[PDB]
């Protein structure tokens, strides 16, 4: 009930600080960097019952994850990694991580002020993408 409220909504992506370098940890390759770092997706953000809703729409590709909170679910990332996910919510951020090939990144999701702030970490490396209201 409420869980999710403030992250419902679309939102569009403003700012990206060292995503490459954060791709080039996970293991991206050169070709699929540099296309996806162009990218300003939208990230669509929905609550039905228990169930949240995550999709990505943007020129390089399109993502979607539904998932109950706590729940493993099985996630094709954007780069076409095969993943087993995991969401919590930790003090009103959402935190997600993604396991595969023995290795393992978290993605928060965070609301300040009026924009939606996503950091990403990779072992050392930090990437934050702020995304506002589309
Ligand atoms: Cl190659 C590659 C590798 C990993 C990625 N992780 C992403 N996430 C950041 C937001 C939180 C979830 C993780 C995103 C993304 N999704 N929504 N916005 N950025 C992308 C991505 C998708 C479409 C276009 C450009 C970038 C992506 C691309």
């Given at each position: 009930s409420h869980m999710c409220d403030a992250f419902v909504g679309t939102w569009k992506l403003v700012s990206s600080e060292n995503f490459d370098d954060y791709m080039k940890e996970v293991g991206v390759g050169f070709a699929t960097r540099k296309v996806a770092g162009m990218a300003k997706p939208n990230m669509?953000?929905?609550?039905?019952?228990?169930?949240?809703?995550?999709?990505?729409?943007?020129?390089?590709?399109?993502?979607?994850?539904?998932?109950?909170?706590?729940?493993?679910?099985?996630?094709?990332?954007?780069?076409?990694?095969?993943?087993?996910?995991?969401?919590?919510?930790?003090?009103?951020?959402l935190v997600h991580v993604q396991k595969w090939d023995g290795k393992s990144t978290t993605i928060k999701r965070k609301r300040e002020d009026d924009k939606l702030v996503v950091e990403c970490v990779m072992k050392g490396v930090t990437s934050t993408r702020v995304y506002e209201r589309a």
């Open positions: 669509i953000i929905s609550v039905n019952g228990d169930v949240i809703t995550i999709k990505s729409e943007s020129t390089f590709k399109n993502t979607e994850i539904s998932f109950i909170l706590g729940q493993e679910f099985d996630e094709v990332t954007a780069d076409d990694r095969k993943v087993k996910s995991t969401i919590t919510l930790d003090g009103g951020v």
